[PDB]
Structures are given as structure tokens and as C-alpha cells.
């Protein structure tokens, strides 16, 4: 590939600075463009860099270009939850219609929310129709916690997932486990669960 | 006392996949640069061909061109693809770019020909079609003018670089450009296309620079029927020329070939028809006369 | 704006598929790319105007065609499993290209493995209600193949986004198998007072892109066509 | 369009028999550029034939110079054979020290 991006994926605490890298071997290098691709949609152009040594700024995105080093850097200042996307580095080899764009693999940015008051707990939720079926919900843990997968093929655990309650300014993490085989207390056993996690008797 | 600097490029496109581009660079009638399609870098054909430019700024300019050669090929091919049914291969593109020197003043140019006919030039800031040019070239101009970066980098070369460079070549090659080479002359003859007439030939080979004066004389009378031929090159960058005179058989005597050249410095070459020398020379070149020209 | 249709497609090996791309921007040039992980977009076919078609960087198996200015279609004469990818369309008159929303295409070896999802809503626990004064509903869509689902939450007939998170990637129900079915979850978190209102209606809606009316079927189960499957729960006074 | 090559053969010095010399073949006014220029001694292709870089004139027509070392005699015949797409057969032009 003629366009290369570091890092593979980047994880930043909400409201900090995130830095993305791009290195290319495209000749001639007329312009460089950064794109944002939100998971499950198209590409949207954030900024364009033209000059031998160029700098550009769009709201909270800023970018540099050093054609001598064939290098580019994208900065996001004060990162937001809705900035979780893949950012794609594109080099265009002509300044006219006859150009062909060169695409990087893209860096994937995942923004972990700053949980002020963790309330770690695992609840049991029962089916609306069939009393018998039930799930386990690990919820309100801090972003430090990573939710591991199952070593048992009968147990299904999902990866952590951030939800935002807009009117309440409340963000929270939550993973879901279920099995047909099994209690909620020992469902997320493979993850490192917090000491003060709440396991209510069923 | 003018000097014309020419950069000539010939690009051949035989089909969608095959292409070559070769380039030559002349200062007047002296070749300074060659650049074959086969070669990766521009070759010098003189030791002073770099002008008065340092390595670290010649290399920057050679890279400019290196990127251009690759890009130019792929650009034409894409324009062909754009005028798909309208235009098709084979295609011959020729480019003549340079600048003429004069005091400190100069005048730059960039002419382009499509299939032998000149159609596009660079003027001021943009590419322009010429008067008389075909109107199918209109979109390919609109496309190529959207390229602000190339237009700017061409403007730099024509307005600034060409002139600044050539002044350096004229200094560097001062010695070679002012060189003087002695012409050598001999006589022959041939049947005229007219019956009973004979065409006398006066070969003048190996003179430099180009400008020269050759006439058949009857004493103080320049024979007004003298036809000056065209200048033919030599392998050592000297020049060959012949001047012919159509005479009636028997009218050959008394005639002479007078050659003036700057290098001679006043002493003209004068070859007399029927001179013991002329008699001696012709014997030294007798042959079987086949397959002579009809 | 650059439109694309379809947005999702499930196809068989050796089937004819046509991805349409429309633009009212009035651009002369139109591009067809495909996106695969660990790659970055690659060029398939591109046009310079009406009637023009030019082989891009990876045109094998693909045959684009441009009937008019607005529309530009990409045709797969005989489909391959390897042609499973996400297909972006682009257009441009600088040389800024404008990208489409993308088509997700899955081409399978056999259709005898296609299943719709089973959708179940899981009601909030009294424990969570008592301790956080908030309520979470888990939606579980399970046993579907291929992974072509779009999960939406609907409160009282209006779709909601606040208080929602759906799984980024679904998980396979048999991680070892290549014909494995999938399972996706999603969560809706409301305030306890909101859940404690019997007048409130919660509906989890899963759109599954499967077989099309043209495709032939023979098996004992119901024809696994594109369809919406839903699960619902009502608020409780308790 | 397609322009027919004009061929001129001439020596660099006054042609003395048995004396080492240089024979020029100067092909002009042709288009397209792709030409096959060949020099012959008694029909046989002369081995060490050097050629200049192709160029073009104000007419846009191309021109190239071919040259080789040769020793002219009373009987040895020299020619220049040019192959081009504007001709059906190749054009052969023999050296005539007189013309
Ligand atoms: C005038 C020259 C004087 C130079 C003085 C120094 C003397 C040293 C002599 C060295 C040997 C010379 C070699 C002989 C070739 C003659 C050269 C001609 C001048 C060419 C001008 C150079 C253009 C430089 C810009 C360039 O490479 N530009 C590239 C890349 O541009 C990219 O990259 C750029 C820079 O990296 C920018 O980022 C913008 C990007 O798009 C452009 O794509 C070039 C294409 C435009 C040229 C086409 C004109 C011919 C028209 C065709 C006729 C119409 C018919 C068509 C129908 C089928």
C-alpha cells in the first residue's frame, strides 16, 4: 500500500487530545485529505492540505502536512463521544480531474467515556413473553474494566457498549451475557470485575 | 547575435498500453541535453551542459522533470479515455519549449502539436488553443487548466528558470560557441535533367558556425544561376553544404567556386574548374558509376 | 448528495447483481470503490461522462455501465463469495470526490443457511429500579444468518436514540464454524418513573435483509425473506 | 497525417579512393518518428553504424542522422535503406559522390 496509517486503532478518554498519523509514498503528492467514516455510513471530508508545508483547522480538527517527509498528522482537541469513527487518510496525485485518489487503511478511534461515579452491578432481566428465558446485564462499571469473552461455548457475552442519556447527561457502560445451559453472579467470571460490584440475589 | 534555446519532446502512444517519450535539448544548433525513454536521468552531451547550476539545484530540477515525464504519459492516456470514440490511437504528441535571448531581455515559449499539427500553446497563466485549431480539444484544455499546481510550476520555468538558466549556458559554453572550423571544398559534376546540359557541384564540408557564403564566379561576376543547397549536418557538429551551377556542355571553363567563411579570416577558398588540382582530385575519386542517381 | 440502491443485498454464487448509484450534483465523473478490512478503498470502475466506462484497479468480475449523467451502475454477471464487500460510489467535477452511503453485499455459497432473527425483549430488574432509579431493557436478536440486521427501538410509535446503545459487531453463536449463525443485542435505558408507567409501550424492531421475491425456495421452513421482526414490552405499575 | 522520409547520402571529407572516411545518411521530413535506418556495403548491413538523437524542425517533421566509418573504392557500393509506414517497400538510396 502507498498510504499507511498509525495507529491501527486508538483509544482516548473523552475530552482529551487524540493524534492520528499518516505516511505515504505517493508520487506526485498534490494534496492530502482526511475523512471521517462513522460506523455504517459513507466518507465525509474533514479537511484538505495543499502546500509543501501546510496547516489547516476546522472547528476542533486541525491537521498538518510535510511533503518533504511525506507525512501528515490529524489532531482532535477535546474529543467527544460522537467522534468514534474510522478516519481515513487520502492522497490525491493530481490537482485536476485526471487524478486518482490513494486510500489508507484508516485508523479506528474509540472514545471511552469518563465515568465520574461508577456503580458496578450485574442484574438479571427476564423475557417479556417467556418467563423462563433470561439475560445478565453487567452495567455502570468504569472504563477501566474490560469485558472478556467466554471460554465456554454455551455462554455468550458481548463487548462493552456506551449509552448516553441525553436529558440527564448520564453516560454508562454495559455488557450482556446469556446462556441456555448458569447464574448471573458467575457469568462475567472471565473479566476482572470490581470488588464493590452489586450481585443481587434472584 | 541571437540565441534560441529549444527543449524538444516527442511522445508516442501506439495503444492504451504502449508509450515512449524521448527528449533533446538544443542551444542554437548545438545539442546540450539528451533524455531517452530508456534512461532514468537526463544525460549531458557537453561538459558545460549543466550551465551555472550547482548539483543540489540541478537534481531538484531533474526531479521536477522526472515526475513530469511519468505524469504526462498517464495524463494523455486519461484524456484519450475521455475523448474515447472521438479520438483514438496511434497518437503522436510533440512539445517544443524554450526561450530566445536578446540586452538582459528574453522571450519564452511552449508549443504543442497533435499529430504533426500545432494546436496548443502556453500563454501567460493557462493552456490555450490556437486559431484554426479543432474544437474537440476544448474540454481537454478545461481539464488541464483546473490544474493550478502545474500551471504555476510551468509559469515559473517560462518566466524565470529558462532565462536564468540560458544566460548560464551562454557563459559556460562561451568557448565552444565561438569556435571556428575550417571548411574544405572540392568539385564534381553531373548530367543536368536538361539535354546537353551539365550540373557542376561545389561540395563545402566541415565548417562551423553555420553562416557561410558560396558562389560560382566568372572572374568578378557571381553566376546568378548559382543554387545554394540546404545545410547538412556532420557527426562532429560541423556543417556540409553544396552549391550547384547548371552549365551547357563546354561552358565549364573559366568558372570558379568561391567560399567565404568567418574562420578563414579573409583568405577565400577558390577552386578553379580545370585547375591541375581539380584534375588531380577527380582522378582520386573515379568509380564505376552505379547505381548513380537518374 | 449521492444516492445508492440497494443498501443491503444477499446473493448466491453465479447470480446477477446490479448496484445502482444516483447523483443530482451534476458531476461528469463517477467512481466505484470497494472497502475491505485491512485495505482502504480500491477502484473498480470509473466514468468520464455519459457512455464512458473505464477499468479501474480491480475490475475483474465486475462490469460497470453508465446509461446517463445522473446514474452509474456496477454489474456482477456471475457472483463470487470473494465479492462480499462494502461498495461505495463516488462523484466529482480542487478534485474533491463526494462519496455515497455504501452498499453492503454478501454473496453466499448456498441459501440453505439463511435464517431470520428471533427477537426478544428483556424487562428491567426490580433491583436496578430500586438501586439506580433507572430501568434498562435488553433486546436480543438471535439465530440469524447472514449478519445483515439494523436494530431500532420504538417508544410509543416514535423511534428513539437517546438512552440507546446497540452492539457494534454481532457475535457468532458457534465461533468455530464458518456457516455459524449470529446474535446481536441492544439496550434502552429509561428512568424508573418512565418504566413505571403502564401507558408506555416499548418495541424492539429488527430489520433483516435476506432473500428476495425472485429467489427460489424449497425447504420445510418459511422462506427466509427480507422482513421486520419485533419484540415488545409494556410499562408496569407493579 | 503521414509524411514520406527524404534520404540524403554524403561523406564528411572529399571522397578519395582507398582512404578512410565517414559516410552520412541524413533522413528528414518524416512522420511518425518510428523509422528503421540501415546502411549497406554491397547489399550487406554495415555492422558498426552509429546514430544521432532524433529531433524535429519548425515544420514539426522529424529528422535523424546516421553515420559510419567507410573506405570508398572504385567498385564498392554504399547505400542507405529506410523502413517507414508511409512507404510500401523500404526506400534504398545509393551513395553518389558526384551528386
Ligand atoms: C521550458 C523548459 C525550460 C527548463 C530550463 C531547464 C533546462 C533543462 C532541460 C531539461 C530537459 C527538458 C526535458 C524536455 C521536456 C520539456 C519540458 C516541458 C515543460 C513541462 C512543464 C513541467 C510541468 C511540471 C508540473 C508537472 O509535473 N505536472 C504534471 C503532474 O502534475 C501534478 O504534480 C504537480 C507537481 O508535483 C502538481 O502537484 C500538480 C499535479 O497535477 C502534469 O500532469 C503534466 C500534464 C500537463 C502537460 C500536458 C500539456 C500537453 C497538452 C497535450 C496536447 C493536447 C492533446 C490531448 C488530446 C489527447
Q: Total number of β-strand segments of chain D?
A: 9
The major sheet of chain C is characterized as: 7 strands, mixed
Shape annotation of chain C:
globular
The dominant shape of chain D is elongated
Main pleated-sheet profile of chain D:
5 strands, antiparallel
CATH topology category name of chain D: Immunoglobulin-like
Q: What is the third-level CATH name, the topology of the largest domain in chain C?
A: Immunoglobulin-like
Structural class of chain C: mainly beta
N-to-C terminal Cα separation of chain C, in Å? 50 Å
CATH C-level class of the largest domain in chain C is: Mainly Beta
Whole-number radius of gyration of chain D? 14 Å
Fraction in helix of chain C: under 10%
SSE series of chain D: EEEEEEEEE
What order do the helices and strands of chain C follow?
Answer: EEEEEEEEEEEEHEEEEEEHEE
Number of helices of chain C: 2
Q: What is the terminal separation of chain D in angstroms? A: 31 Å
Our count of domains of chain C comes out at: 2
Indicate the percent of residues in helices of chain D.
Answer: under 10%
Report the structural category of chain D: mainly beta
Please identify, by name, the CATH architecture of the largest domain in chain C.
Answer: Sandwich
Summarize the model shown.
It is classed as immune system. Chain B is α+β, with helices and mostly antiparallel strands and 294 residues long. Chain B has helices spanning 55-82, 138-145, 148-172, 174-177, 276-283, and strands at 3-13, 19-27, 30-35, 43-44, 91-101, 106-114, 117-123, 126-129, 184-191, 197-207, 213-218, 221-222, 227-228, 232-233, 239-248, 256-260, 269-272.
Structure description:
The complex is a heterotetramer of chains A (202), B (294), C (238) and D (99). Chain A is an all-beta fold and 202 residues long. Chain A has no helices and 16 strands. In chain A, 37% of the residues are buried. Chain B is 25% helix and 37% strand. The two termini of chain B are 42 Å apart. In chain B, strand 14 (232-233) and strand 15 (239-248) form a beta hairpin. In chain B, the strands form 3 sheets. Chain B has an 8-stranded antiparallel sheet with strand order 4-3-2-1-5-6-7-8. Chain B is built from 5 helices and 17 strands. Chain C is built from 2 helices and 20 strands. Chain C has 238 residues and is mainly beta. In chain C, the strands form 4 sheets. In chain C, strands 2, 4, 5, 6, 9, 10 and 11 form a 7-stranded mixed sheet that branches. In chain C, strands 12, 13, 16, 17 and 18 form a 5-stranded antiparallel sheet that branches. Chain D has one domain (1-99): Sandwich (Immunoglobulin-like), CATH 2.60.40. Chain D has strands at 6-11, 21-30, 36-41, 44-45, 50-51, 55-56, 62-70, 78-83, 91-94. In chain D, strands 1, 2, 5, 6 and 7 form a 5-stranded antiparallel sheet that branches. A 4-stranded antiparallel sheet of chain D has the order 4-3-8-9, with no helix packed on it. Chain D contains no helices and 9 strands. Chain D is elongated and about 45 Å long. In chain D, strand 6 (55-56) and strand 7 form a beta hairpin. Chains in contact: A-B, A-C, B-C, B-D. Chains A and C meet through strand 4, strand 5, strand 12, strand 13 and strand 15 of A and strand 12, helix 1, strand 13, strand 16 and strand 18 of C. Strand 12 (121-127) of chain A pairs antiparallel with strand 12 of chain C, so a sheet runs across the interface. Ligand 3GH sits between chains B (7, 9, 23, 25, 33, 35, 42, 64-65, 67-68, 71-72, 75-76, 79-80, 87, 93, 95, 97-98, 112, 114, 120, 137, 140, 144, 147, 149-150, 153-154, 157-158, 161-162, 165) and A (28, 30, 94-96).
